[PDB]
Amino acid sequence: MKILVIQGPNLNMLGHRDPRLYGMVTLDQIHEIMQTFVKQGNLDVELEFFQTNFEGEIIDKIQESVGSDYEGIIINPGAFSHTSIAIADAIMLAGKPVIEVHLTNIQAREEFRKNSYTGAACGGVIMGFGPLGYNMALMAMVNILAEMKAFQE
Amino acid sequence: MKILVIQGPNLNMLGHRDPRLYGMVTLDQIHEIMQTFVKQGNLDVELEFFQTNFEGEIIDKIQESVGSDYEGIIINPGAFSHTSIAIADAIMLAGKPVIEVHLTNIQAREEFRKNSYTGAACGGVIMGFGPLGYNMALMAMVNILAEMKAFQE
Amino acid sequence: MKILVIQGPNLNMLGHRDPRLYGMVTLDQIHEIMQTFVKQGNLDVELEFFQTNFEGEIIDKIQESVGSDYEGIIINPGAFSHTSIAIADAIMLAGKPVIEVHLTNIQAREEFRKNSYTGAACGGVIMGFGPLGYNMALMAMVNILAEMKAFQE
Amino acid sequence: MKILVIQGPNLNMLGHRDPRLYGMVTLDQIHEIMQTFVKQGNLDVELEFFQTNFEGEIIDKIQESVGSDYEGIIINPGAFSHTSIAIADAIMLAGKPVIEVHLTNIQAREEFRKNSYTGAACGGVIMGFGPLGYNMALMAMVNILAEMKAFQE
Amino acid sequence: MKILVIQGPNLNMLGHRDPRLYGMVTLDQIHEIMQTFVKQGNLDVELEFFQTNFEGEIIDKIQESVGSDYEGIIINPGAFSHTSIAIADAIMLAGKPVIEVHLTNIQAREEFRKNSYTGAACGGVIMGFGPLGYNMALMAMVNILAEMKAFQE
Amino acid sequence: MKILVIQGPNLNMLGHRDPRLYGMVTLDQIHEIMQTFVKQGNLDVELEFFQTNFEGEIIDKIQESVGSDYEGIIINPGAFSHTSIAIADAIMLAGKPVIEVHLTNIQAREEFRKNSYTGAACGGVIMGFGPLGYNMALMAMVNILAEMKAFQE
Amino acid sequence: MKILVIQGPNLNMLGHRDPRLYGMVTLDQIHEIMQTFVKQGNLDVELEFFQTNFEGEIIDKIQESVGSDYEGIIINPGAFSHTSIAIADAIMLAGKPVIEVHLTNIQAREEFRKNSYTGAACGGVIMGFGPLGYNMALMAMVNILAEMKAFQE
Amino acid sequence: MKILVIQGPNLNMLGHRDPRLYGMVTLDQIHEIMQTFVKQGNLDVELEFFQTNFEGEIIDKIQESVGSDYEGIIINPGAFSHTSIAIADAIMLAGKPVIEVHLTNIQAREEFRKNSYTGAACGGVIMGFGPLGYNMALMAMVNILAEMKAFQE
Amino acid sequence: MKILVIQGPNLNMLGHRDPRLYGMVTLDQIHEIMQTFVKQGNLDVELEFFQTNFEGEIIDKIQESVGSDYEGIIINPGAFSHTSIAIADAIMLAGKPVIEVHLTNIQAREEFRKNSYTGAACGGVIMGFGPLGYNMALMAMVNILAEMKAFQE
Amino acid sequence: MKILVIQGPNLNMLGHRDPRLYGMVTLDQIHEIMQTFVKQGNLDVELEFFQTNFEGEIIDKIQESVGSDYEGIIINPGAFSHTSIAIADAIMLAGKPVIEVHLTNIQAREEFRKNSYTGAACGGVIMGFGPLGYNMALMAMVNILAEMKAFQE
Amino acid sequence: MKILVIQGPNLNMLGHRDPRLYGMVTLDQIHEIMQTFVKQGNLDVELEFFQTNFEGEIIDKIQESVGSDYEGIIINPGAFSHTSIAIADAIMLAGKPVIEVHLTNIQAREEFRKNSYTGAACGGVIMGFGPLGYNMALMAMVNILAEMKAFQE
Amino acid sequence: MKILVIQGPNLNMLGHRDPRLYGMVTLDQIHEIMQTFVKQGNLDVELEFFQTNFEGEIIDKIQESVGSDYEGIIINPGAFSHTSIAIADAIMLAGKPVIEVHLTNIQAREEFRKNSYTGAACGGVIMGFGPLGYNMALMAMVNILAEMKAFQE
Numbered sequence A, B, C, D, E, F, G, H, I, J, K, L: 001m002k003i004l005v006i007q008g009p010n011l012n013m014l015g016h017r018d019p020r021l022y023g024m025v026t027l028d029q030i031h032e033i034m035q036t037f038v039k040q041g042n043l044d045v046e047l048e049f050f051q052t053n054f055e056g057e058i059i060d061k062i063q064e065s066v067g068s069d070y071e072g073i074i075i076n077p078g079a080f081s082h083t084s085i086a087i088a089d090a091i092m093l094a095g096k097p098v099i100e101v102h103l104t105n106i107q108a109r110e111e112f113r114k115n116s117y118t119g120a121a122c123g124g125v126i127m128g129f130g131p132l133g134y135n136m137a138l139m140a141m142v143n144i145l146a147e148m149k150a151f152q153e
């Protein structure tokens, strides 16, 4: 059961500079925290991680998930959340669960960050919990998938 | 370790009518699902549930949590999320973690629902996961509390 | 055949001060005019009147109509018309005819009064006819109910 | 006692196509329903019906009512409600009661339909009751006229 | 197979003044170009041409197409495109293909010209191709009709 | 030397009702005041007066001035000034001086009256001088024409 | 000579948390300061203090002042100032002096706090002077009442 | 009979540079044209001319006109028209006719020039006639004064 | 203990015309009222009064207060309150208490008067109390100063 | 005679999912339809097709057309139409005909889709005709090119 | 070769208070830094420095540069940058290079500071480099002048 | 001492077409001009030049400067300046001086070009000086670096 984790622009710079707002934890560390959570719960999940600064690479990857044995996507589109109708469209055509995560509470920042095009296209949105938000996304993803397949039977 | 769950206007009408958008699950059923989650994880948590249609009662209850042995609040202010500066202020003065939950993805609805005053005052916001969102709030709450007390020592 | 008449904030102050805009007739007098209309037409209707200054009480009352033998609601939400998404939602979940009345023509007043959240959630809206508007609401309610039960057979 | 009923653009297309939103009843049928209401109440009223697609014809007709033995106007300006300051001015200079009717609840439709210039210029506005709204207009007109002439004596 | 071509306000002044923006071709010349296209393709189409400066005449004509053996409408509402909800409604009730044409690219002009109420009600919109845009509308009309009748069988 | 005076919707109702804002003078009286001014100055000017409530008639008349021996237009588009892109276009293609007149100061009224599409298309605009404004238009017109023909030689 | 002091939502939490923006003084301490001012000036005033988190209770209390021997109201509506047309209406019908007080300078905060519906309905507004603002309101109230009764004689 | 002519910022730079938009005529030349008009009509008027670049000097001068034997003001506030509430207030308190003139048609320029605070405070506004606009202002001023004194008697 | 009282544009015209909105009291009379208050309370205060119509003079004066033995400023910027970022900056750099006063309730007037740039830069704002507002400003100033120097010790 | 067809983000996902709004036809099928049109008309045109999800790739390709023997561009920028000033600039510097195509009527969708930066930079725009729109673009392109080269001679 | 350096409101207060945002350097020190730069580069430039708090003095000075042997202007209009259409106009008529400087990055401050009317009228704008910005203006001015006179020959 | 010069979309097309607005100088020529400035001043600077049409490449490059011996960045983000929150974020995390350059005065162009997200994130911004702007950036960069290292010691 494969989950694709997509990390948008600038998230690779996390923690390395300790630049206050986003915190001390690096992107790799966030990804280790995710693995840890997967093992410590015996959840039946293999993660693929992907980070990019290109809007087009985010769309490419969402698209490459379509034909494949990828069950769901957890995504933090970063600054593209607010601007990218294109990623929003790609999310709408993914035909599989997409969950949007934000480290910070984007409700509580500048006006230009409150809107999330991408988040409106997702099933659900998690914001403001730091790295923990990603594990919350994993929990929900596992439940969302469990419930999708339960119904099948 | 006491968590206060506050349920805003109209949420008590959930499920009883099956009114499409919000689902089939009743508010009691959401609260049972929470207890179930608390036991099935052996989490050290006693829940107090409260539902009201009064802005004033939501504020009263947030305030009554202040002096007490209430560790945190999980809240779905419902339609007040978009309008209630008053509840937002109450949340800011609660001096304890507040997590906002929405059944539906309020990013993906009418313009007048995208803004959340109350959500901006909370540490974090969860939207669009149906009842599961509340358990996600629980997970996060337990972790946020764990981490607050870890640092104490 | 029971009709619930809900009167929002400040409407109990009617007439007592003769405060120009709204007129000389008291809220009780409006309610007497309604009974009079019910008898003088031999309409088969028992009215329950309710006035409150609390958003929460309006919602409570709309909700308490749901399980009961209340056939429809006539409501003047007063200044809450313009602000209350919460009452609007309550009206949408009432699953019975709701008609909104206003004494004054809210189209012809300040910008902040032109919007009616609640009115959009109602089947119909009557504005600007003074107390007469309420009898027009009665007429329409009786017809709407007649037509609902005609179709049943 | 003459009442002028003015029907704005496209209302002559009613019912003939059964085009969903507005219903099944034709404009003639609406006018018959009005006569029927006038007889079944023995109201002392002769109706003149007029339908046009021309803003200019609506204004012309409102103006031609001024010198005459027309006591009041019932008007559904249709899509001109939202755009026509010119008809609004005509209504203000009619110096006799004007009541605006809409079949549909214009509060509950697109943003561009919520404004009614013409409705602000009328004494009162009725929306969302289907053809019934016109009889409600008749009821109100008869009362408004009764009350105008009562005060004379 | 009859197509009605409707030309809105001011289009009759085309070319006669060579007034720069719109060009050198007259409205008659646009209509000849259309006939020429119909013959040079052997398309099975009789054109009726109509030009007016009255919003009301455009609506009248759209309505008069309803009962008749008019298969579709090609329309350039001119300045009414931006303002006329009434024509937009008429187009919505025409129950037959309507195609909007603009000589100039209305996206690239003043803000007040970018909105097209009428264009949103049409199946499709062509702008910025000078008189050629009309032939494009003919091509598309013939295809849309071909495809409507193909499906019939 | 022929000047066309165009009077927009409702201006024919002037004075007859003494309806406060616009005054006591009738439209005929305004036109007499113009003739009087033309004689008392020996200006070489024949006036044609035209009043209509139809947008379409205003456009028609501007257009019919084009081929003719009409030297210029004085126009008070009334409520259309604020709404009518169509008339604004007609004015732009008149290829002769157009002067816009308003009785009242449209700067000092409701927001929806401050904009004048038609006024932006005219050479010049006169507002707020009551009927005297028309004579001011005449003066200016005569001067503008004088100066156009002076330059010819 | 009775003055009613109304304190809106959250003001009861003042000072107890020392939550920075509003200060260190408690609501009781604000009320003591007021009594002290009344004695130290020998002003002929009995104060009734009231604090609530309910919009409805504020309206109730304003209304209950109408029939009574309450001469004036000093009110800090708190977060309701910005949102509550209902309280604004109640203030308009109080038919006695109402003075709005704010601890903080609401001009200098978030955009959503600059508007005061309630403040526009009051005779006057005092902001940004901490608890001192209440005594200023007392001074002004005593003067306004002095001047009202002076004129009587 | 004294008329004060106030010329706002930058108008002294007229014509000297021939800077296209405003023309070739200098400010002195405009003032000579005014004198000429006064003589060629035998109008009973002494003009005082004043030009400044200071908002405060415009206000000072308007104020100094109050006590004096200045009968009316003709003013072109220039760029201050759009911005200066202060001059607008000064115009409202002048208690004598003020006419606003603009060389260019400020309706037909940038959005930031369409608003005229000052013009809304004037009795009337003249725009877009070049220097001629000033003589139009003189004509109107003379008539306005004539009519003010006629009534006296 | 010196307080500088700055009076913005047009305030010197007060009362002389009795121009309705602002009242009957002259600016000198307002200043006398202030002296009277200072004596009748034995407050230890010398007032310097200054009125100007120049934005630049207000700024100059604010600046000249900096080096001097001026303890605080009471200012009514008049129409500049709404427009003057420059004065707002000057107030921010005064490094002493500045209190803004308005005779009228600027919340309750035109939209363009609700904003106060200058008021946001002040510690506090008083509006809508007529001349009395100035004495309220004195009371507050004396208290603010008392409290500044109490802390010193 | 080479035409470059550029297909923006997500268009490669067409039809494969049958995702309702855009239809059943795949992108390849759209391109085949284009070739077919080119043959069935004997038009003298070689098409190069290009699809990308990268804004940067669209710009690159537009730029690579400049030096080459590419006569014109037909482009559907997809979601970038609304957001991409950069592509809009590239189109403006292409110095050759660019035609914008949309499958869907972007006038009739969400507010954020009505604006087309790219469409404003194109000579012309076609929307709402499904894949047929591309053939319409071909017809127009061939005519635009024919007319460009006719003039040459 | 004379350069006029104009310094807008409040800039004379620089450094003296060390008021954080703008820095520690006084206005005199900025002017010394400019002389120093002129010598250390042997640039052929005499500087005239001017500081004022009056909008009108800025305009006066720009105007007085016109007739003279002033080659260019470096200007920091301060808070007037955002508000002053009048200075913007003065700049446009200066017919010589004008360069706008800001100490702070006005893009990165409050919304009301992002707009620069004056900056739009300048050839170029420099912001956010502290006092160094002025030397950068000098560099550019010298280059702009060199290039203007190079072309002459 | 290494400076990275980043050139955004379309800038590589400079000069080659002579497309009026931006000029005649090619991007290579701008880079030569920069080297020339570096030698003719003996400044101790090695430049790396980079041009791209990809938002993601700009971010990649800003990021790759972080770990390296790159001292500062000069950047012209081109059309991305107005839209790219992502690049703005990258700039904020670069932890080294970033200077934004624009050839043209973006204040003086379309509304959609006035905003610069990226510019707000930079230390300073230079606009409207053609290619010279880059040398001005160099000058400033060298000074900013000199001053950063001066303080170190």
Ligand SMILES: Cc1ccc2sc(COC3=C[C@@](O)(C(=O)O)C[C@@H](O)[C@@H]3O)cc2c1
Residues within 6 Å of the ligand: B009, B010, B011, B012, B013, B014, B015, B019, B022, B076, B077, B078, B079, B080, B081, B101, B102, B103, B104, B105, B106, B113, C089, C090, C092, C093
């Ligand atoms: C007829 C009907 C039937 C059941 C219910 S429950 C309900 C709650 O109000 C809201 C809840 C949210 O917080 C959520 O999605 O959890 C969204 C919020 O916008 C909405 O007011 C509204 C509603 C309406």
Ligand SMILES: Cc1ccc2sc(COC3=C[C@@](O)(C(=O)O)C[C@@H](O)[C@@H]3O)cc2c1
Residues within 6 Å of the ligand: E009, E010, E011, E013, E014, E015, E019, E022, E076, E077, E078, E079, E080, E081, E101, E102, E103, E104, E105, E106, E113, F089, F090, F092, F093, F094
């Ligand atoms: C002086 C002048 C001369 C000739 C013409 S033709 C004309 C048509 O009105 C309009 C037509 C459009 O539909 C189009 O682009 O074809 C756009 C619409 O905005 C414009 O008003 C307006 C106009 C104006």
Ligand SMILES: Cc1ccc2sc(COC3=C[C@@](O)(C(=O)O)C[C@@H](O)[C@@H]3O)cc2c1
Residues within 6 Å of the ligand: D089, D090, D092, D093, F009, F010, F011, F012, F013, F014, F015, F019, F022, F076, F077, F078, F079, F080, F081, F101, F102, F103, F104, F105, F106, F113
């Ligand atoms: C009840 C009544 C009685 C008489 C009249 S006349 C009239 C004309 O409409 C208008 C004319 C103006 O152009 C003008 O002041 O000359 C202003 C414009 O805003 C208004 O629509 C409107 C109107 C309304």
Ligand SMILES: Cc1ccc2sc(COC3=C[C@@](O)(C(=O)O)C[C@@H](O)[C@@H]3O)cc2c1
Residues within 6 Å of the ligand: B089, B090, B092, B093, B094, G009, G010, G011, G013, G014, G015, G019, G022, G076, G077, G078, G079, G080, G081, G101, G102, G103, G104, G105, G106, G113
């Ligand atoms: C965490 C916290 C701690 C203490 C307090 S007290 C309070 C009052 O609510 C308000 C009062 C104001 O009237 C005022 O400035 O006095 C302004 C209003 O915007 C604000 O909501 C809000 C609040 C919030």
Ligand SMILES: Cc1ccc2sc(COC3=C[C@@](O)(C(=O)O)C[C@@H](O)[C@@H]3O)cc2c1
Residues within 6 Å of the ligand: H089, H090, H092, H093, H094, I009, I010, I011, I012, I013, I014, I015, I019, I022, I076, I077, I078, I079, I080, I081, I101, I102, I103, I104, I105, I106, I113
């Ligand atoms: C015809 C007239 C007559 C007298 C006066 S005095 C005056 C002062 O300007 C203002 C003062 C305020 O600060 C206030 O309420 O004290 C409000 C402000 O908006 C107004 O411009 C404006 C004005 C206007």
Ligand SMILES: Cc1ccc2sc(COC3=C[C@@](O)(C(=O)O)C[C@@H](O)[C@@H]3O)cc2c1
Residues within 6 Å of the ligand: A089, A090, A092, A093, A094, J009, J010, J011, J012, J013, J014, J015, J019, J022, J076, J077, J078, J079, J080, J081, J101, J102, J103, J104, J105, J106, J113
């Ligand atoms: C789930 C889904 C499935 C398939 C596709 S294809 C697609 C293309 O993007 C767009 C194309 C348009 O240009 C058009 O109408 O041709 C409109 C544009 O707004 C839209 O983003 C968006 C999309 C979304």
Ligand SMILES: Cc1ccc2sc(COC3=C[C@@](O)(C(=O)O)C[C@@H](O)[C@@H]3O)cc2c1
Residues within 6 Å of the ligand: I089, I090, I092, I093, K009, K010, K011, K012, K013, K014, K019, K022, K076, K077, K078, K079, K080, K081, K101, K102, K103, K104, K105, K106, K113
């Ligand atoms: C408390 C305070 C203390 C000292 C100073 S100096 C000053 C200058 O005015 C301004 C100058 C700018 O042009 C600039 O950044 O150089 C920005 C402008 O918005 C500001 O008003 C504003 C100001 C404010």
Ligand SMILES: Cc1ccc2sc(COC3=C[C@@](O)(C(=O)O)C[C@@H](O)[C@@H]3O)cc2c1
Residues within 6 Å of the ligand: J089, J090, J092, J093, L009, L010, L011, L012, L013, L014, L019, L022, L076, L077, L078, L079, L080, L081, L101, L102, L103, L104, L105, L106, L113
């Ligand atoms: C047809 C055309 C031809 C050549 C070029 S080069 C170019 C660069 O992009 C931009 C650069 C700016 O940063 C600047 O002024 O340096 C402004 C920005 O808005 C513009 O997109 C835009 C452009 C457009």
